[PDB]
Tab-separated table of C-alpha atoms and ligand atoms in Angstrom:
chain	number	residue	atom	x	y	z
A	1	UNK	CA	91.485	92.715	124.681
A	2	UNK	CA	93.947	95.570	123.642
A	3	UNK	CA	91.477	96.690	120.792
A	4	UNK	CA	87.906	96.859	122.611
A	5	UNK	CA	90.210	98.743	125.793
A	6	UNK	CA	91.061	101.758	122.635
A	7	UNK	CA	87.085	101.115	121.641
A	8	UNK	CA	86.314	102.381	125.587
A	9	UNK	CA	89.273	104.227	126.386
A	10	UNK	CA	90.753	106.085	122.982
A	11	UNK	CA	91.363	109.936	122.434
A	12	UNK	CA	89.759	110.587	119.015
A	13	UNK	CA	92.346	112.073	117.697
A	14	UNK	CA	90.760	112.859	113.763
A	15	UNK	CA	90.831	116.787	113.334
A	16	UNK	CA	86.599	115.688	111.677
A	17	UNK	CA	86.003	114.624	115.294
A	18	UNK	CA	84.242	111.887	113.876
A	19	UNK	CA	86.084	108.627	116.342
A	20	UNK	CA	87.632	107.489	112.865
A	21	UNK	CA	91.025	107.312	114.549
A	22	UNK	CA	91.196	106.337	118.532
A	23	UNK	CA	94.257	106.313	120.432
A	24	UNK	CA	95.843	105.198	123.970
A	25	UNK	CA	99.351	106.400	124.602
A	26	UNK	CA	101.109	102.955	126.275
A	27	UNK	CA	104.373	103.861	126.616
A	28	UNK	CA	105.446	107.983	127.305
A	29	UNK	CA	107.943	108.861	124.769
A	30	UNK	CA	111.625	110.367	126.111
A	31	UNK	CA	111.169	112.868	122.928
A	32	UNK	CA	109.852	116.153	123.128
A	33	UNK	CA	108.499	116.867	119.517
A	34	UNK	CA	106.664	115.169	117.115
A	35	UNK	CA	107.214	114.239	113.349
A	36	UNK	CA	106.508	117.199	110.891
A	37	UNK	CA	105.001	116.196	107.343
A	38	UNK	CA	107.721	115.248	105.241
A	39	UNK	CA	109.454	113.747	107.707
A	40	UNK	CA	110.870	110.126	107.016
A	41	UNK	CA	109.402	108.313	110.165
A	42	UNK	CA	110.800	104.540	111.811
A	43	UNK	CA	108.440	102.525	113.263
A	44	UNK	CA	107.384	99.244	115.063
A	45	UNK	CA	104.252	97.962	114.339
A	46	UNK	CA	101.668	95.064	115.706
A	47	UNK	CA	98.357	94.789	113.252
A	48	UNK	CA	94.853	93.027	114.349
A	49	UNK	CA	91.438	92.367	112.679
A	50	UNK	CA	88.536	93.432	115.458
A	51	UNK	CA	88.608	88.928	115.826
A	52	UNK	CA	92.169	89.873	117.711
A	53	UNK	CA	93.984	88.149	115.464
A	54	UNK	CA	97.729	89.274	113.723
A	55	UNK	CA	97.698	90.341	110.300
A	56	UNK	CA	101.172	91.639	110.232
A	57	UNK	CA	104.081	92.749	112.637
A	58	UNK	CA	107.380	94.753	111.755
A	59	UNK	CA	109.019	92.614	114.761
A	60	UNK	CA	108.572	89.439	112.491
A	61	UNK	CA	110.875	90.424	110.197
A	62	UNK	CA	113.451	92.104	112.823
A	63	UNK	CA	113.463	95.834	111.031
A	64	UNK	CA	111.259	98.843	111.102
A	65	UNK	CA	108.405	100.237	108.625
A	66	UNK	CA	109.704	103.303	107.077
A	67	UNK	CA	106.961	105.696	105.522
A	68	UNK	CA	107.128	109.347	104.602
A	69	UNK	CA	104.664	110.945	106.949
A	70	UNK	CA	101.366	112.774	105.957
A	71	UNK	CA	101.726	112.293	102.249
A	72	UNK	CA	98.666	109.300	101.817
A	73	UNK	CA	101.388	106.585	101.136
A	74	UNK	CA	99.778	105.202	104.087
A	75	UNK	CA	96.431	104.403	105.746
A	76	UNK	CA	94.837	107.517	106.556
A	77	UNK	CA	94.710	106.497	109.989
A	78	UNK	CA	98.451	106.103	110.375
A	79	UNK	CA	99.617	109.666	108.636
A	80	UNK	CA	96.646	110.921	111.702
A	81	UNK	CA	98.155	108.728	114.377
A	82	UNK	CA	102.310	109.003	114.195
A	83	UNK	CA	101.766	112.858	113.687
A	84	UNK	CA	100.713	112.654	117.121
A	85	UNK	CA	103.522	110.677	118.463
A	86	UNK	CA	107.253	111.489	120.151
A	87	UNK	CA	110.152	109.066	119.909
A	88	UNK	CA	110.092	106.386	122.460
A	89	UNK	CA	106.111	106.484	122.663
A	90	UNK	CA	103.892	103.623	121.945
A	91	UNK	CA	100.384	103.483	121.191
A	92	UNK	CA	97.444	101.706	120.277
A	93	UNK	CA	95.421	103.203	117.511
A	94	UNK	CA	91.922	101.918	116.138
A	95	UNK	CA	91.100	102.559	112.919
A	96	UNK	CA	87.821	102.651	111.364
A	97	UNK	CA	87.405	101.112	108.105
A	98	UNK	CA	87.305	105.065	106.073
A	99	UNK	CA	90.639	105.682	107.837
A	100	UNK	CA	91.841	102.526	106.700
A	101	UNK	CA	90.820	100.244	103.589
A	102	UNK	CA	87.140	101.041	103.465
A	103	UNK	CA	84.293	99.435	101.763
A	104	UNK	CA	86.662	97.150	99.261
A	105	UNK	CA	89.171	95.936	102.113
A	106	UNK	CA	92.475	94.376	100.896
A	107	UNK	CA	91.994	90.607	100.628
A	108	UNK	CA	93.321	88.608	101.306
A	109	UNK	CA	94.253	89.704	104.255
A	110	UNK	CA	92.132	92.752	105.315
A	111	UNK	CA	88.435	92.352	104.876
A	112	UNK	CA	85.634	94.731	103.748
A	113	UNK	CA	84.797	97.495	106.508
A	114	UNK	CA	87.271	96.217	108.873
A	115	UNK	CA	88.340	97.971	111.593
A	116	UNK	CA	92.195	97.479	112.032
A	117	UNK	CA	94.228	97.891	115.879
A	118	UNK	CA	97.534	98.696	115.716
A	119	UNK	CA	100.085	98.625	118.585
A	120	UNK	CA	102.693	101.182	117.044
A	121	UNK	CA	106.120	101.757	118.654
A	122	UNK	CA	107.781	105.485	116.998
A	123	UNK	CA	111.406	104.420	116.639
A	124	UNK	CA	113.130	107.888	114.966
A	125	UNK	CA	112.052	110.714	112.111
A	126	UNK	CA	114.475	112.314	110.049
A	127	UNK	CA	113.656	115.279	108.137
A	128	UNK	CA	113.266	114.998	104.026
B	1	UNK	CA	127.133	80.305	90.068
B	2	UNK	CA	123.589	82.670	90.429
B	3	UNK	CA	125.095	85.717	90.913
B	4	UNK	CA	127.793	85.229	88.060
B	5	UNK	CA	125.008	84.296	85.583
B	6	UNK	CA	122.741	87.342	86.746
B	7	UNK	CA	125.937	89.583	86.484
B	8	UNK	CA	126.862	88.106	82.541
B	9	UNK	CA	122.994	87.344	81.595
B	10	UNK	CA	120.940	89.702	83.130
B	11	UNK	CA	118.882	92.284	81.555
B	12	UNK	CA	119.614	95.676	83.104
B	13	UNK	CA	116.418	96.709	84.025
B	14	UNK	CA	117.051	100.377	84.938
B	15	UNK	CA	115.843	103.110	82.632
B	16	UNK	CA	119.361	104.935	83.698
B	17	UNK	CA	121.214	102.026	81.750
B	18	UNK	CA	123.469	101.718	84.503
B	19	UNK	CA	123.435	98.441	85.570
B	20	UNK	CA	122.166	98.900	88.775
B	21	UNK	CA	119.224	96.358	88.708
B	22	UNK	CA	120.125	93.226	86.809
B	23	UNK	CA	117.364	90.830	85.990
B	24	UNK	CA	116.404	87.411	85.109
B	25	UNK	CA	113.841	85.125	84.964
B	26	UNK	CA	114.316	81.984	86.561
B	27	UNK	CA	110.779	80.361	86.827
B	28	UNK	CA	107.986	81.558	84.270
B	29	UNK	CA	104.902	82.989	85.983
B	30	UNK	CA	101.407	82.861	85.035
B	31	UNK	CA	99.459	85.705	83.881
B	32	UNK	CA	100.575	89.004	81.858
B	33	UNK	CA	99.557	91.225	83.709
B	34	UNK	CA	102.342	92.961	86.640
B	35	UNK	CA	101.371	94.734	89.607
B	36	UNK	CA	100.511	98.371	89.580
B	37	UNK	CA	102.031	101.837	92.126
B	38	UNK	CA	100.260	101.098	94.951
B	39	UNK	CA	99.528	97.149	94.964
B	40	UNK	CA	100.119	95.272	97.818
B	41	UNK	CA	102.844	92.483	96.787
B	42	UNK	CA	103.125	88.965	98.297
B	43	UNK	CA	106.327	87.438	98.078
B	44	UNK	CA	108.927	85.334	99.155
B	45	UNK	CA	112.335	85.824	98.902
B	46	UNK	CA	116.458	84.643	99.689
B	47	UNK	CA	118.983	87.607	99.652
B	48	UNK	CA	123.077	87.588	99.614
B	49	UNK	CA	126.063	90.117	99.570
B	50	UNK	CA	128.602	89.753	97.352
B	51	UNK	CA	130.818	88.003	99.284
B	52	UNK	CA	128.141	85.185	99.614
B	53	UNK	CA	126.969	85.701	102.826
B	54	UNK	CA	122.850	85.238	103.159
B	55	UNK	CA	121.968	88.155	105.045
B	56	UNK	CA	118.008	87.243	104.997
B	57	UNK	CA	114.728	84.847	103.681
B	58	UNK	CA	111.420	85.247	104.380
B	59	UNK	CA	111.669	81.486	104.417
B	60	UNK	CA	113.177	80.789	107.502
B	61	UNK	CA	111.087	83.193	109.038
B	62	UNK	CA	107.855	81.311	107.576
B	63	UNK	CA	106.482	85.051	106.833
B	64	UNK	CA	105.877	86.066	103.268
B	65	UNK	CA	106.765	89.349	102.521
B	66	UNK	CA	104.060	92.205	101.721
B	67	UNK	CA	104.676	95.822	100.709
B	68	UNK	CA	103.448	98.499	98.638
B	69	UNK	CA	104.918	98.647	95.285
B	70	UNK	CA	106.706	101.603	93.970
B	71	UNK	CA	106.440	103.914	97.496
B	72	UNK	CA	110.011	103.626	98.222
B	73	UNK	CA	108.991	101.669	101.418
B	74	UNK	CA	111.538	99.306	100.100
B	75	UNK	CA	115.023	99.835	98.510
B	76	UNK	CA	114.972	101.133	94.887
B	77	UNK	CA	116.065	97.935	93.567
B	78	UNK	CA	112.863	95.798	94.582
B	79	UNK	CA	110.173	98.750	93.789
B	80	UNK	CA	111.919	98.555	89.879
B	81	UNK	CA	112.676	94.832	90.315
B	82	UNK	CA	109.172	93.383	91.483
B	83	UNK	CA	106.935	95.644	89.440
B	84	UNK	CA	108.218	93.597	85.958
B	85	UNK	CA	107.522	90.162	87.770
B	86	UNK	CA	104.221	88.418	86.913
B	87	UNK	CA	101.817	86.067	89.678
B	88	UNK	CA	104.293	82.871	90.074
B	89	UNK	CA	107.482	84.415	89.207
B	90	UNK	CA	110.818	83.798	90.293
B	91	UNK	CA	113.527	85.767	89.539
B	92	UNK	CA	117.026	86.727	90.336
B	93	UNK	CA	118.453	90.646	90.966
B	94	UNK	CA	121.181	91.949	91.513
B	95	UNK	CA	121.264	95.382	93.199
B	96	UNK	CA	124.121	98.054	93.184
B	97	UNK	CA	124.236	99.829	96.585
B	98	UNK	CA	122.847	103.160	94.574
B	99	UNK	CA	119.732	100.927	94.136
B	100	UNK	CA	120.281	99.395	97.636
B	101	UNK	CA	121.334	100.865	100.674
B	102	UNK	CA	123.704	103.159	99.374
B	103	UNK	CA	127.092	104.253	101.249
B	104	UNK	CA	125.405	104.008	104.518
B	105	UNK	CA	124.692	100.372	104.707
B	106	UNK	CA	122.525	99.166	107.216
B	107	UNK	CA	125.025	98.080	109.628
B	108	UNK	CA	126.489	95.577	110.586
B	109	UNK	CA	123.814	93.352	108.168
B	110	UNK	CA	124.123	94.891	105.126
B	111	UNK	CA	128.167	96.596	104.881
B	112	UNK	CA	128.686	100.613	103.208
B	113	UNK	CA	127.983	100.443	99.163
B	114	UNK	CA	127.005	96.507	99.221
B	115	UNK	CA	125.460	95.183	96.285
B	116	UNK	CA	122.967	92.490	96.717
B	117	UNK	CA	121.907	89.535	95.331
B	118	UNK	CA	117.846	88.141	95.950
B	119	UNK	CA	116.112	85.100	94.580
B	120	UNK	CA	112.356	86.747	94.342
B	121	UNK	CA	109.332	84.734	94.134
B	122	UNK	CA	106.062	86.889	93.566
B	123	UNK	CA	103.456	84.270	95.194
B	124	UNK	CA	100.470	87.355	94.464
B	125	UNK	CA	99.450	90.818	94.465
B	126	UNK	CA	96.341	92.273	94.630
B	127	UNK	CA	95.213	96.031	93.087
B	128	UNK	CA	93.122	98.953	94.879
C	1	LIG	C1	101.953	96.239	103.501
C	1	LIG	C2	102.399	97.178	104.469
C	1	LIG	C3	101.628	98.401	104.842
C	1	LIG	C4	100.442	98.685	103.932
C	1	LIG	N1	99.968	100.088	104.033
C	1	LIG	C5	100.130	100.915	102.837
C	1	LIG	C6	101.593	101.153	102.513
C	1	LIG	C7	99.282	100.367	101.656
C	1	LIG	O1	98.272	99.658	101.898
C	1	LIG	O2	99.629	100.727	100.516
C	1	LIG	C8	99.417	100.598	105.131
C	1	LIG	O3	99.016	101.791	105.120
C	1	LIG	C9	99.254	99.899	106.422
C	1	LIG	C10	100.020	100.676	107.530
C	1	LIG	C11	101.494	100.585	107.298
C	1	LIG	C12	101.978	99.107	107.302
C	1	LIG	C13	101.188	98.234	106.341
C	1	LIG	N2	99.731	98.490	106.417
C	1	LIG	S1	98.877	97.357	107.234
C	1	LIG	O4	97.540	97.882	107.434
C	1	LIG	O5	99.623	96.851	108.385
C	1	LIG	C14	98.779	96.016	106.089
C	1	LIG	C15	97.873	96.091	105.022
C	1	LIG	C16	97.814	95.061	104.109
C	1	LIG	CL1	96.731	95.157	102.760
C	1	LIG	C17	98.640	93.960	104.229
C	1	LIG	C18	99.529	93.887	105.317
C	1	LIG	CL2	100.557	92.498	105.487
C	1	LIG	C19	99.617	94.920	106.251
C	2	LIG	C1	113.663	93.039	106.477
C	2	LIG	C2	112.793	93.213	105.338
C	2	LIG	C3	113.161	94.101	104.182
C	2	LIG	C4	114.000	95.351	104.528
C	2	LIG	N1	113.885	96.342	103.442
C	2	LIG	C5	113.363	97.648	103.846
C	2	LIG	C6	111.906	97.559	104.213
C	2	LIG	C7	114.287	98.376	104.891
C	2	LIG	O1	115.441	97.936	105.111
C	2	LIG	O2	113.867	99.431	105.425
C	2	LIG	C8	114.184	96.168	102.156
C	2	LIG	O3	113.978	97.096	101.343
C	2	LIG	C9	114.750	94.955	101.582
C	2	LIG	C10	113.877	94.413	100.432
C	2	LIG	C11	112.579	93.869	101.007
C	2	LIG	C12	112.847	92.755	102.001
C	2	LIG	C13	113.812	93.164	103.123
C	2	LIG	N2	114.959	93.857	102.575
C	2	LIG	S1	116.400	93.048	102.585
C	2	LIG	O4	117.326	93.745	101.727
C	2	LIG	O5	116.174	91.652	102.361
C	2	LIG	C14	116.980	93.227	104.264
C	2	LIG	C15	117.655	94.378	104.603
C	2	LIG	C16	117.996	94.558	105.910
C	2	LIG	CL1	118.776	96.013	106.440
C	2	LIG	C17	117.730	93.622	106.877
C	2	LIG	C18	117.083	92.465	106.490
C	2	LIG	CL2	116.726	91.293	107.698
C	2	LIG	C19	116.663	92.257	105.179
């Protein structure tokens, strides 16, 4: 499915090259730049356990995930992975369990070493 | 009716004093203990404007709610609000727009310097 096709296909795009963080741009975005840290970043989001199955969505609840980018208020993965995107662009990211909630997890709804797929849509960024 | 008894009863939870989060308990949890910066909160919730209008529930969506408390990844008045609630809450706020979503509004949903009315329940939370 969409997360064993970013297991085969994914840039690692972690500056340890160490495949923590795999990505596969789905959608070109029309924007030309991408976030700086600080920024105030709007996003779309689809989450799934490596089983496929949905453990959350931004489109349930009909409004975007706002997070200020690159400051570790998020999954390590995700300050990585929206630094690399433009407006308009969606992605699928995999994220290795040190990039995301490690060893301990987040029951009960991420488990221990779980490797998370996101389908991410970047909506805007605004500076600070 | 809520919101009158939440405007004369409630505690003003703010450390400003200015009576931008107004609080009370309407169901007694379980536990002491309140969720910590950082915990991911489960809960489920019914919010108004001031001219009665339900603008959202988690309920008729069928989706608890889960954020990070105290990241600002959601208005001012929930990160202050939620963090004094213990597991099995429910409580009622009400939110001036400085606490809420300002002069901007999120338009058309939520107007320019609303203040808001929720019915909280926090079902869990779960430290990191
Ligand atoms: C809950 C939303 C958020 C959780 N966090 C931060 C804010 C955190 O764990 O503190 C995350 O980094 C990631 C990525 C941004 C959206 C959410 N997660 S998440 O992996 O989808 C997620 C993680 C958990 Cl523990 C629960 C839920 Cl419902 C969703
Ligand atoms: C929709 C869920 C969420 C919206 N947000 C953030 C995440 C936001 O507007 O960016 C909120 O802070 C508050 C409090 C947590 C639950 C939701 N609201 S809310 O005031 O009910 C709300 C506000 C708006 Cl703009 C739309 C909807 Cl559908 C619901």
């Amino acid at each position: 499915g969409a997360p064993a096709t970013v297991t085969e296909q994914g840039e690692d795009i972690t500056s340890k090259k160490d495949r923590g963080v795999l990505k596969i741009v789905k959608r070109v975005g029309n924007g030309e730049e991408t976030p700086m840290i600080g920024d105030k970043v709007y996003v779309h989001y689809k989450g799934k356990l490596s089983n496929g199955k949905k453990f959350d969505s931004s489109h349930d609840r009909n409004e975007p995930f706002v997070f200020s980018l690159g400051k570790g208020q998020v999954i390590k993965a995700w300050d990585i992975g929206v630094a690399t995107m433009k407006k308009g662009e969606i992605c699928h990211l995999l994220c290795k369990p040190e990039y995301a909630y490690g060893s301990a997890g987040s029951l009960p709804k991420i488990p221990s070493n779980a490797t998370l797929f996101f389908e991410i849509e970047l909506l805007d960024f605004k500076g600070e």
